[PDB]
Amino acid sequence: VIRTSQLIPEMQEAFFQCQVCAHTTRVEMDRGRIAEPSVCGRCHTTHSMALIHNRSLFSDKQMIKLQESPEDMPAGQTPHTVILFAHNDLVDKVQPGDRVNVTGIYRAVPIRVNPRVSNVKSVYKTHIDVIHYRKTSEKRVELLKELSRKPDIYERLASALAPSIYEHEDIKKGILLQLFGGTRKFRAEINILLCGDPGTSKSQLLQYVYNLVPRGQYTSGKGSSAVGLTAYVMKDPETRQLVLQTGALVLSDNGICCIDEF
Amino acid sequence: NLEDLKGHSVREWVSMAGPRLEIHHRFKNFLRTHVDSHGHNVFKERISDMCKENRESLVVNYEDLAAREHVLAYFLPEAPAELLQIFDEAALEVVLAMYPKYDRITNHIHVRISHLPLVEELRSLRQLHLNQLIRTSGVVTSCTGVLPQLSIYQNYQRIRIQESPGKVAAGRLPRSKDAILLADLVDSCKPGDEIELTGIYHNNYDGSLNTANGFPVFATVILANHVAKKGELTDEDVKMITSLSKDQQIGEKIFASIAPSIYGHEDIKRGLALALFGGEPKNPGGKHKVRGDINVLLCGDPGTAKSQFLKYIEKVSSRAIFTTGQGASAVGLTAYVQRHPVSREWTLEAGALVLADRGVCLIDEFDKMNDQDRTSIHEAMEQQSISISKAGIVTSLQARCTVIAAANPIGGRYDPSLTFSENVDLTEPIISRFDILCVVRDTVDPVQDEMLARFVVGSHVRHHPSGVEPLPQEVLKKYIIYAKERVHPKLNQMDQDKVAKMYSDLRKESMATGSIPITVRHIESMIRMAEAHARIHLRDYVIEDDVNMAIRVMLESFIDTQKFSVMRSMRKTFAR
Amino acid sequence: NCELLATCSALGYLEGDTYHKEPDCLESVKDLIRYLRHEDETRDVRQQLGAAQILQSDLLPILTQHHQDKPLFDAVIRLMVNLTQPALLCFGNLPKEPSFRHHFLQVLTYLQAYKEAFASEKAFGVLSETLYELLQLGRQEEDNLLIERILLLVRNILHVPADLDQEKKIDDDASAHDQLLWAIHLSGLDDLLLFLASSSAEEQWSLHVLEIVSLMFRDQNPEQLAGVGQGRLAQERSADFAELEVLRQREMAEKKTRALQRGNRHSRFGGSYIVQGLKSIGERDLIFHKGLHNLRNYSSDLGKQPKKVPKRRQAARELSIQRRSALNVRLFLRDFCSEFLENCYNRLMGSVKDHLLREKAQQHDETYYMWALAFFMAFNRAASFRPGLVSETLSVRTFHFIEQNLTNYYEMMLTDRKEAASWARRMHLALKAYQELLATVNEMDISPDEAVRESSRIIKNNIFYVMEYRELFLALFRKFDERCQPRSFLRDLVETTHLFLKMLERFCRSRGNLVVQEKEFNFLDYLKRFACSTVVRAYVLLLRSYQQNSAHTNHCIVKMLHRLAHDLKMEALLFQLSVFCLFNRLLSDPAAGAYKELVTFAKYILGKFFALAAVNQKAFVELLFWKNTAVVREMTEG
Amino acid sequence: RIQETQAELPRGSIPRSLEVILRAEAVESAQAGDKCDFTGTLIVVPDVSKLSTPGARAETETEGIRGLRALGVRDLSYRLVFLACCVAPTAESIKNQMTVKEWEKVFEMSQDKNLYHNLCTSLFPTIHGNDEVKRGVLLMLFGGVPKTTGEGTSLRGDINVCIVGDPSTAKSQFLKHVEEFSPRAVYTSGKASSAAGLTAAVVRDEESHEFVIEAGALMLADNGVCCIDEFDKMDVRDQVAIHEAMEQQTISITKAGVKATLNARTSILAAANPISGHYDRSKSLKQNINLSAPIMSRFDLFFILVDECNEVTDYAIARRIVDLHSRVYSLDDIRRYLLFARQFKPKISKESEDFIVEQYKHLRQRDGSGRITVRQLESMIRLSEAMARMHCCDEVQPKHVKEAFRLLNKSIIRVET
DNA sequence: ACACACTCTCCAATTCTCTAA
DNA sequence: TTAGAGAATTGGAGAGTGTGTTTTTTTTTTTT
Ligand SMILES: Nc1ncnc2c1ncn2[C@@H]1O[C@H](COP(=O)(O)OP(=O)(O)NP(=O)(O)O)[C@@H](O)[C@H]1O
Ligand SMILES: [Mg+2]
Ligand SMILES: [Zn+2]
């Protein structure tokens, strides 16, 4: 997945009311065409029936954009893409960057040459009409209680961290203590610093502990980093309205933030 | 009775024949009968001045209109487009009654209202105010050319005004509105002006807004009726001004009336007074122009009221600008070039020295500018122009201003063991462009401390929210604007031998100590100071007394440049 | 415009709350009269005076504060009597010309404003005090004229209609008419109406009081008015919550039926089906493009728009709607009505009948007299007081009088095409009053008194022996028309027919045979006259609105229909495709449980139809067409 | 335009935003950055550019609806909007808010004995020792009456205070504590976290490549209190701008496309470190610190904090800390009383002038005998008036002048010695 | 070249009136 | 009593007319 639109409302049943005598009628609608009344049947006055937008009945729709995954590409080429439409229940179930399997109906539609004119082009545009898609306890408490009541549990829990690293036990203990933390005036949480030569396993250790905690974040002090430490304001690429982009430090509130090339 | 509002809106009521005629007669009778506190007719004088200068535009004050004919004052803001029409019709026949031939000059006269009490802020306008007379303030940012508009044809111009900077809250953004200027109001303003605008609030349909918002929302604009910045002296004003000039001690009264709350410092007040009135520019033979303005520099110890004097000068004068040290750039001081927002071409715009023009440009922390910014003012201070050649543009602009500056001595305190040049650290091409130079120092006399402290304590109890006698500040303001506009001193003769001998001797000594170098500029400076003293006395011709005053000021300010031990010998050398 | 607006100012001016007249105000109002005396047929001076708002601005202060000058008071009263005269009387009709229509509407607008302005109780108070003084004289012609013009002034004020379309008020709120009526009570002016109605020598004024009283009560029907009582607050509160509940429930149910009928997938999901074997209008099978669920209730016409009717082809419609006034007004009206019936009805009716009989050259409006007896008899019967309270009207002369008036209206409606609508309205009013007479004689039969029962037999005997009453219903049914009368007339006519047949049947049971104007009577032969197929068409039209018809209406029509079909054996006259369409809709509606008699009768007659159709296939043709009596009887023979 | 609040945004998601519409009496009741609750209804708005009417024409990967007369042969599309009928945050005012309980409390405070020390204890309960600092910082909250001279120039109201000390000790505690207590206050440092820093700056707006201003800390702290940490280390650009901001209480800009005067009316409380970390007890403050004489001469009061490792003192501090972790007037009483006190505008008495001028003369001749400027006389007036205001006295009686002189004299003596 | 808005015309549907079945 | 033919008024089916429609050079502030 690459991008997901805002939610789009869609008409189902139009509500018409007479300006002259307030008589009302409902029109079930036909593959996008509305059968507008010509005359009010009660008061026999032509061109007097008006569509009431907020009394009509609506449904939800969303537009999703998807790309072929990098594994199945021919060598050195750029990837292809398709457009998916999802209705009602399915209308908000995926987010950018993740990967899915989708089943749907392969539709094709003509397009108009200009918004005023009624001529259509001779080459059609196709899209997928989505039908289904798939992404690719007391027992635990008692186990935890028994394990906590076992001796040298502090050493054991520390030992469990980063099995690729064979000797730095007290560093693992410090990291474990940071993950547990104090409790709530004064700053209750803990901050730790790792120093020494480049090429040492410290970055791997950051990436390991980052993957252990739900509210975690990871970035670099270099300007090439994917997300900044500083909050800023920018124009939305879709609407070109302003949006406030908070930095990694804010997002990791009540969480751990790993910083590299500090 | 005109007040009998029944069964009709006021717009409908004043449309009726009976009420229209009553309003017409009441305004006409008000024009002929209105009297000042002295028993003088006000509008006889004002109409006669309008006719003598062919100006075709009559100003009325809301306050005394209300005070004498309240019923009309009550209707006026509720239906302005009706009562203003009736008022125009009534004024023209009074003018023709007094001056029967004036229809040869014009066939219409416009009445303009002033001092309307119900001022509103530029962001507090609401639909409650539509089609009523209002008053607001702001600074002009955009201003079209003057164009002709159908009616016959008349002048038309459109402007955009926004909230004055520093009246918006910190870090947020200003609101703005559009206004329309018709007939004699065009070129009553230019970009960067701050103005007071009285007008009618008016709205109309616009399809662009309806399609942009999706709701049936209208656009609005202000029709201007009177515009004024935030001479018109009466006979009584010029009479009192001219009568004051008879006093042989007028110099003491004017000098003692500058920055009144500052105790002591006689020399500073005198120097600032001469710079405030100024000498006269001239161009003998057409090929040799020379400037009129008198520049001033102040330097000395901290806590001696240097910054305070500039703020007073900013308040008493008109067309004044104030700026500080690192807060200004070379480009901001002179003029700048930009890609124009809507014309999409390179354009040139005025900086501080151009925007001030025939006014005062005040600088503070002059010691702490970047040197590359401070050297931008050399042309404007002497040649009195600003020449630019950038981005295909090649042009020059007027820079006809007076510069006043304040600085600190090197290391924070002045040493009398060293000369001015040794203590200030400014180069000769800068030092020589200031006409008056002053040095201010700490002193430690106990009686002077007691007097100063007692005066300051007295000042604090005096201003709680609750020498000769000085003038009221409004009288002094009237005096300055009269003197600069109605008197132009002529130098018909003076003693060349006396000045030449003194100058040669002075220059020779300046070579000896090197405290300041003395050049041709000093002679021309004394001519400027002599004319300024002549102007303070409202005299058309320079006389012997003026030349002696100029020489005294010049030599007194020069002796202070020297080392303490040398000053005694120098003072005895130049005995006057 | 400006000329009148400038000159009319002369009357005076207002100082806070004290009004100061000008010293020549009398001459000034005389000049206003001189303006009106030379006014245009467009009523331009009246529109100008209205625009200047002279009546509201000056005349009300003059009447309230300066009435001590009796000549000035008289001048002001007569001036505003001329100004307030109803627009229909001023123009003579609602104009056809658009310019005169605009002037009429503007004049009526100013009259509406005057009616609102007159709501101040002080005016009615001064008027009542003045009138109280005048009646103490037991007088000069000018005194009689002042009484006359006072009565006509309040008449004119009451007469101009309220714009319910402007007000759009909810029930139990006060309209302009309601507030003004309450002001009549608050002024005590009503007491003088009851004096004038009850005092014998004031008969010349009683005719005017009839118009005043009948103008007041227009919005309230006597049955619901008799219903009111002090506990109505909680009753309306609780009932309104229940009404709101059922309304919400109905909308929910209907929504869900539509929701199930529609498919679940979106409107562009597509698909197409062939209905194999079902041929088109063309040579081949139908192709169906809509959703699968729609075939469960398919009819091919669902895609078609209705036929566009011509302008002049439209039927008549009601220009009025049911209402209820504020509870304070309802209580006051009930008290006044009770006191009028207690003191004034018989004396006023005798006086009005005397004037209508004597004064034929004056062309007094008989419809008010019939309205008043129709209203007060219904109120009296709803309260079930003794018949003695309405004694004067309980005589044969009333039946003959209203029969000749109603038949005159019928003949005029047929002959006088240029006014047939108004003649129909007059005829409808007469029919309503006649129905109340029948209800009254029916009620006294179930009284405990033999004397009034014998009087009832005497009246009913004359009504059934004479031709006119038994022939009249058939005469009205024969000439009912959709342009001529709205369906309300048909409802009243058929319900009155049911009541007439009920009393006729009860009267026929008294002897072995009834003889009438001369022939031996037969009830079944009389009912055979109603077997005309036009009458059945009118009945079927009234049946289309059975859900909106009253319970009594539905009972009456279905009872008469079953009797006519079953006992006369004319059943096949009801075998009609239009009727069968209505039966289909009837049995389809889930609300059928409320209409047991109607659905059982429908299934019964359809059973007869299918029993015949099983033998004879020609019934499918006969179903399209209306039957002559001979055809109805021949269909069973085959 | 509104956006999802920080509490709702699901992890990894981009924020969603919505258009809200306000009408009639609710207009301009919310500013950018505010967090509010809105009540109303969700509605559907058509594309008005494609409809046509007798009054006005139509202007002109999805499709809209079709088949209305007003729409011709075009197609119509909708969008979602939220119509809000109500919005709320998520001298006479004192009379309206203070009940009889609050009136009784401020009256009891006005009648209190040794109220000065009681308020010091109440506002700074955590602090140990250092009463002079507590008295000095407490007086700053009461300010001093500003005055406008008849010719239009104005005289400074706020006092400014400076604290120098060793990085190990109390100076940081005062700043963060008063900031937590006080309304409408700003914390910052000479090593500021923005391009603006302590005073306004110019930035080019990419929406037009046009130059505009951006606010610094002293603009936002207008009409409030400003706390500056590590003040000994500061940018030169701000240091020059501070010269004007300290006394003139304004900021002046003159650069390409921008010319303005901006307000900076503020009371400053500054914290600084001496050279080599620990204060040299043998040397004056002016020898110890980094600040220049022009900036240093601006402050009305100075104080010095330096540690020494006394065992009992260390043990007491440790026990205080651990006991605090183990666990007269409330802060709202101080707030209510302070807002009550700041409405008084006491005058100086005629007799007080003699004492004031005498004390200034004594100080000046002492300075001349072994430098003091006119600014010190102003500070005497400001401090004494603040004392009178804090006791809610009607005029500046001599008892206030004596203590004000004592504080100033002790500060200057320990600055010099 | 292909869509709205407006103006205008002629053909024949609906009702009145007189007549025969 | 029920139904068809000749004359008058009116609706609307249909035609005609007018109009609209990323990629380069230069400046200014502040970051280095
Ligand atoms: N003689 C005086 N009379 C009245 N007020 C004075 C006097 N001398 C100093 N002050 C006050 O001292 C304060 C500082 O004034 P200011 O003009 O900034 O002096 P300064 O020498 O320019 N200080 P600085 O800018 O650091 O060199 C102001 O409040 C002045 O009003
Ligand atoms: Mg200064
Ligand atoms: Zn309708």
mmCIF file with all atom_site columns, C-alpha atoms in Angstrom, chain B residues 123 126 165-166 170-172 175 205 207 210-211 213-215 259-261 302-303 307-308 311-312 315 322-324 326-329 331-332 336 352 355 365 368 443-444 446 449-450 452-454 456-457 460-461 463-465 473, chain D residues 21 23 28 31-32 43 45 48-49 56 59 79 145-155 215 219-220 240 243-244 248 252-257 259-263 345-348 353 356-357 360-361 364 373-375 377 381:
data_model
loop_
_atom_site.group_PDB
_atom_site.id
_atom_site.type_symbol
_atom_site.label_atom_id
_atom_site.label_alt_id
_atom_site.label_comp_id
_atom_site.label_asym_id
_atom_site.label_entity_id
_atom_site.label_seq_id
_atom_site.pdbx_PDB_ins_code
_atom_site.Cartn_x
_atom_site.Cartn_y
_atom_site.Cartn_z
_atom_site.occupancy
_atom_site.B_iso_or_equiv
_atom_site.pdbx_formal_charge
_atom_site.auth_seq_id
_atom_site.auth_comp_id
_atom_site.auth_asym_id
_atom_site.auth_atom_id
_atom_site.pdbx_PDB_model_num
ATOM 1   C CA . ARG B 1 123 ? -11.051 43.376 13.483  1.00 0.00 ? 123 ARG B CA 1
ATOM 2   C CA . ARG B 1 126 ? -19.566 42.757 12.234  1.00 0.00 ? 126 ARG B CA 1
ATOM 3   C CA . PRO B 1 165 ? 2.206   46.383 13.788  1.00 0.00 ? 165 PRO B CA 1
ATOM 4   C CA . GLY B 1 166 ? 2.632   46.048 17.537  1.00 0.00 ? 166 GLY B CA 1
ATOM 5   C CA . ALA B 1 170 ? 2.681   38.665 19.901  1.00 0.00 ? 170 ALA B CA 1
ATOM 6   C CA . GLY B 1 171 ? 3.286   35.980 17.255  1.00 0.00 ? 171 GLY B CA 1
ATOM 7   C CA . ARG B 1 172 ? -0.219  36.070 15.646  1.00 0.00 ? 172 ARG B CA 1
ATOM 8   C CA . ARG B 1 175 ? -6.627  41.576 9.722   1.00 0.00 ? 175 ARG B CA 1
ATOM 9   C CA . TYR B 1 205 ? -22.203 39.909 -3.866  1.00 0.00 ? 205 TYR B CA 1
ATOM 10  C CA . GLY B 1 207 ? -19.413 34.615 -7.026  1.00 0.00 ? 207 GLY B CA 1
ATOM 11  C CA . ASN B 1 210 ? -19.715 31.653 -2.851  1.00 0.00 ? 210 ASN B CA 1
ATOM 12  C CA . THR B 1 211 ? -17.877 29.011 -4.901  1.00 0.00 ? 211 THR B CA 1
ATOM 13  C CA . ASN B 1 213 ? -16.831 28.550 0.653   1.00 0.00 ? 213 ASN B CA 1
ATOM 14  C CA . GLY B 1 214 ? -20.028 26.808 -0.527  1.00 0.00 ? 214 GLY B CA 1
ATOM 15  C CA . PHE B 1 215 ? -22.275 29.260 1.424   1.00 0.00 ? 215 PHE B CA 1
ATOM 16  C CA . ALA B 1 259 ? 12.660  67.540 27.061  1.00 0.00 ? 259 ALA B CA 1
ATOM 17  C CA . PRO B 1 260 ? 11.362  69.432 30.156  1.00 0.00 ? 260 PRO B CA 1
ATOM 18  C CA . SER B 1 261 ? 11.647  66.596 32.724  1.00 0.00 ? 261 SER B CA 1
ATOM 19  C CA . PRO B 1 302 ? 25.909  55.462 30.897  1.00 0.00 ? 302 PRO B CA 1
ATOM 20  C CA . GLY B 1 303 ? 22.871  56.657 32.841  1.00 0.00 ? 303 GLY B CA 1
ATOM 21  C CA . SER B 1 307 ? 18.345  57.479 25.078  1.00 0.00 ? 307 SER B CA 1
ATOM 22  C CA . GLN B 1 308 ? 15.600  59.627 26.643  1.00 0.00 ? 308 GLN B CA 1
ATOM 23  C CA . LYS B 1 311 ? 12.397  59.630 22.419  1.00 0.00 ? 311 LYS B CA 1
ATOM 24  C CA . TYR B 1 312 ? 11.377  63.216 23.201  1.00 0.00 ? 312 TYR B CA 1
ATOM 25  C CA . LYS B 1 315 ? 7.378   62.764 20.047  1.00 0.00 ? 315 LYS B CA 1
ATOM 26  C CA . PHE B 1 322 ? 13.573  55.529 15.330  1.00 0.00 ? 322 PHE B CA 1
ATOM 27  C CA . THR B 1 323 ? 15.980  52.557 15.033  1.00 0.00 ? 323 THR B CA 1
ATOM 28  C CA . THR B 1 324 ? 18.723  50.748 17.041  1.00 0.00 ? 324 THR B CA 1
ATOM 29  C CA . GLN B 1 326 ? 21.999  45.612 15.221  1.00 0.00 ? 326 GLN B CA 1
ATOM 30  C CA . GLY B 1 327 ? 18.265  45.996 14.499  1.00 0.00 ? 327 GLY B CA 1
ATOM 31  C CA . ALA B 1 328 ? 18.969  47.662 11.110  1.00 0.00 ? 328 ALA B CA 1
ATOM 32  C CA . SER B 1 329 ? 20.601  46.609 7.816   1.00 0.00 ? 329 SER B CA 1
ATOM 33  C CA . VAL B 1 331 ? 19.398  47.596 2.657   1.00 0.00 ? 331 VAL B CA 1
ATOM 34  C CA . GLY B 1 332 ? 16.767  48.542 5.242   1.00 0.00 ? 332 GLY B CA 1
ATOM 35  C CA . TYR B 1 336 ? 15.546  47.437 -1.558  1.00 0.00 ? 336 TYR B CA 1
ATOM 36  C CA . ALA B 1 352 ? 14.298  54.374 6.256   1.00 0.00 ? 352 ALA B CA 1
ATOM 37  C CA . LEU B 1 355 ? 10.772  57.149 3.863   1.00 0.00 ? 355 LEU B CA 1
ATOM 38  C CA . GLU B 1 365 ? 23.448  52.245 19.794  1.00 0.00 ? 365 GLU B CA 1
ATOM 39  C CA . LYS B 1 368 ? 27.300  48.682 17.714  1.00 0.00 ? 368 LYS B CA 1
ATOM 40  C CA . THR B 1 443 ? 30.128  64.481 38.061  1.00 0.00 ? 443 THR B CA 1
ATOM 41  C CA . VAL B 1 444 ? 30.339  64.163 41.872  1.00 0.00 ? 444 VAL B CA 1
ATOM 42  C CA . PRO B 1 446 ? 27.230  66.929 46.518  1.00 0.00 ? 446 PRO B CA 1
ATOM 43  C CA . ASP B 1 449 ? 23.577  65.471 43.485  1.00 0.00 ? 449 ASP B CA 1
ATOM 44  C CA . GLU B 1 450 ? 21.113  66.786 46.065  1.00 0.00 ? 450 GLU B CA 1
ATOM 45  C CA . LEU B 1 452 ? 19.180  66.416 40.871  1.00 0.00 ? 452 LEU B CA 1
ATOM 46  C CA . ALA B 1 453 ? 17.847  63.812 43.322  1.00 0.00 ? 453 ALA B CA 1
ATOM 47  C CA . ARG B 1 454 ? 15.317  66.240 44.820  1.00 0.00 ? 454 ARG B CA 1
ATOM 48  C CA . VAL B 1 456 ? 13.719  63.505 40.279  1.00 0.00 ? 456 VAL B CA 1
ATOM 49  C CA . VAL B 1 457 ? 11.767  62.696 43.473  1.00 0.00 ? 457 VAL B CA 1
ATOM 50  C CA . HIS B 1 460 ? 7.817   61.159 40.523  1.00 0.00 ? 460 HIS B CA 1
ATOM 51  C CA . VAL B 1 461 ? 5.291   62.684 42.927  1.00 0.00 ? 461 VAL B CA 1
ATOM 52  C CA . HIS B 1 463 ? 3.462   62.566 37.493  1.00 0.00 ? 463 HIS B CA 1
ATOM 53  C CA . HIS B 1 464 ? 1.705   59.982 39.713  1.00 0.00 ? 464 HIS B CA 1
ATOM 54  C CA . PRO B 1 465 ? -1.578  58.941 37.920  1.00 0.00 ? 465 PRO B CA 1
ATOM 55  C CA . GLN B 1 473 ? 4.123   71.748 24.283  1.00 0.00 ? 473 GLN B CA 1
ATOM 56  C CA . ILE D 2 21  ? -18.069 26.265 10.708  1.00 0.00 ? 21  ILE D CA 1
ATOM 57  C CA . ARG D 2 23  ? -21.848 31.346 13.263  1.00 0.00 ? 23  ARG D CA 1
ATOM 58  C CA . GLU D 2 28  ? -13.715 34.398 16.874  1.00 0.00 ? 28  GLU D CA 1
ATOM 59  C CA . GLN D 2 31  ? -7.407  30.846 18.208  1.00 0.00 ? 31  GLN D CA 1
ATOM 60  C CA . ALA D 2 32  ? -4.827  28.626 16.478  1.00 0.00 ? 32  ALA D CA 1
ATOM 61  C CA . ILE D 2 43  ? -23.443 17.777 7.193   1.00 0.00 ? 43  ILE D CA 1
ATOM 62  C CA . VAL D 2 45  ? -21.956 20.205 1.216   1.00 0.00 ? 45  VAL D CA 1
ATOM 63  C CA . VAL D 2 48  ? -21.438 24.719 -5.787  1.00 0.00 ? 48  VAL D CA 1
ATOM 64  C CA . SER D 2 49  ? -19.309 25.470 -8.886  1.00 0.00 ? 49  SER D CA 1
ATOM 65  C CA . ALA D 2 56  ? -26.072 32.817 -11.645 1.00 0.00 ? 56  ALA D CA 1
ATOM 66  C CA . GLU D 2 59  ? -18.595 28.246 -13.470 1.00 0.00 ? 59  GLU D CA 1
ATOM 67  C CA . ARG D 2 79  ? -17.734 16.723 0.915   1.00 0.00 ? 79  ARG D CA 1
ATOM 68  C CA . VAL D 2 145 ? 3.610   51.875 39.362  1.00 0.00 ? 145 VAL D CA 1
ATOM 69  C CA . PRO D 2 146 ? 4.457   53.049 35.790  1.00 0.00 ? 146 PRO D CA 1
ATOM 70  C CA . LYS D 2 147 ? 4.253   56.795 35.068  1.00 0.00 ? 147 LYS D CA 1
ATOM 71  C CA . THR D 2 148 ? 3.847   58.871 31.872  1.00 0.00 ? 148 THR D CA 1
ATOM 72  C CA . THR D 2 149 ? 5.491   62.310 31.824  1.00 0.00 ? 149 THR D CA 1
ATOM 73  C CA . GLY D 2 150 ? 3.452   65.184 30.371  1.00 0.00 ? 150 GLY D CA 1
ATOM 74  C CA . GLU D 2 151 ? 5.656   65.604 27.269  1.00 0.00 ? 151 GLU D CA 1
ATOM 75  C CA . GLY D 2 152 ? 4.923   61.927 26.346  1.00 0.00 ? 152 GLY D CA 1
ATOM 76  C CA . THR D 2 153 ? 8.034   60.068 27.584  1.00 0.00 ? 153 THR D CA 1
ATOM 77  C CA . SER D 2 154 ? 7.472   57.283 30.169  1.00 0.00 ? 154 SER D CA 1
ATOM 78  C CA . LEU D 2 155 ? 9.182   55.943 33.320  1.00 0.00 ? 155 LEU D CA 1
ATOM 79  C CA . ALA D 2 215 ? 8.424   36.251 18.087  1.00 0.00 ? 215 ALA D CA 1
ATOM 80  C CA . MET D 2 219 ? 7.762   39.271 23.260  1.00 0.00 ? 219 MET D CA 1
ATOM 81  C CA . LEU D 2 220 ? 5.734   36.304 24.510  1.00 0.00 ? 220 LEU D CA 1
ATOM 82  C CA . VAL D 2 240 ? 22.736  44.019 21.737  1.00 0.00 ? 240 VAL D CA 1
ATOM 83  C CA . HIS D 2 243 ? 20.117  46.867 25.837  1.00 0.00 ? 243 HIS D CA 1
ATOM 84  C CA . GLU D 2 244 ? 16.912  48.473 24.515  1.00 0.00 ? 244 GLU D CA 1
ATOM 85  C CA . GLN D 2 248 ? 12.758  51.021 26.932  1.00 0.00 ? 248 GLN D CA 1
ATOM 86  C CA . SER D 2 252 ? 12.768  48.051 17.050  1.00 0.00 ? 252 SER D CA 1
ATOM 87  C CA . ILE D 2 253 ? 13.355  46.382 13.629  1.00 0.00 ? 253 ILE D CA 1
ATOM 88  C CA . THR D 2 254 ? 14.386  47.993 10.271  1.00 0.00 ? 254 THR D CA 1
ATOM 89  C CA . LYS D 2 255 ? 15.316  45.477 7.506   1.00 0.00 ? 255 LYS D CA 1
ATOM 90  C CA . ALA D 2 256 ? 14.238  44.557 3.955   1.00 0.00 ? 256 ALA D CA 1
ATOM 91  C CA . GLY D 2 257 ? 10.445  44.525 3.717   1.00 0.00 ? 257 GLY D CA 1
ATOM 92  C CA . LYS D 2 259 ? 9.723   48.085 9.710   1.00 0.00 ? 259 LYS D CA 1
ATOM 93  C CA . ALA D 2 260 ? 8.056   47.875 13.147  1.00 0.00 ? 260 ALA D CA 1
ATOM 94  C CA . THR D 2 261 ? 8.055   48.736 16.876  1.00 0.00 ? 261 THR D CA 1
ATOM 95  C CA . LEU D 2 262 ? 7.189   45.827 19.209  1.00 0.00 ? 262 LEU D CA 1
ATOM 96  C CA . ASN D 2 263 ? 6.329   45.710 22.944  1.00 0.00 ? 263 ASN D CA 1
ATOM 97  C CA . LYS D 2 345 ? -1.290  52.739 43.606  1.00 0.00 ? 345 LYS D CA 1
ATOM 98  C CA . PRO D 2 346 ? 0.334   54.268 46.726  1.00 0.00 ? 346 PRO D CA 1
ATOM 99  C CA . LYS D 2 347 ? 1.853   57.769 46.697  1.00 0.00 ? 347 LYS D CA 1
ATOM 100 C CA . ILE D 2 348 ? 5.093   58.850 48.384  1.00 0.00 ? 348 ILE D CA 1
ATOM 101 C CA . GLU D 2 353 ? 11.175  62.620 50.238  1.00 0.00 ? 353 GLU D CA 1
ATOM 102 C CA . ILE D 2 356 ? 14.953  59.245 50.273  1.00 0.00 ? 356 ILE D CA 1
ATOM 103 C CA . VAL D 2 357 ? 17.083  62.189 49.112  1.00 0.00 ? 357 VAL D CA 1
ATOM 104 C CA . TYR D 2 360 ? 20.791  58.710 48.078  1.00 0.00 ? 360 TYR D CA 1
ATOM 105 C CA . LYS D 2 361 ? 23.132  61.571 49.032  1.00 0.00 ? 361 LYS D CA 1
ATOM 106 C CA . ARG D 2 364 ? 26.694  58.938 46.550  1.00 0.00 ? 364 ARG D CA 1
ATOM 107 C CA . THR D 2 373 ? 24.182  56.540 38.870  1.00 0.00 ? 373 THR D CA 1
ATOM 108 C CA . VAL D 2 374 ? 20.661  58.020 38.717  1.00 0.00 ? 374 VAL D CA 1
ATOM 109 C CA . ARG D 2 375 ? 19.301  54.483 38.083  1.00 0.00 ? 375 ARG D CA 1
ATOM 110 C CA . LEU D 2 377 ? 17.631  56.347 42.881  1.00 0.00 ? 377 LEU D CA 1
ATOM 111 C CA . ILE D 2 381 ? 11.742  54.327 44.750  1.00 0.00 ? 381 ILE D CA 1
#
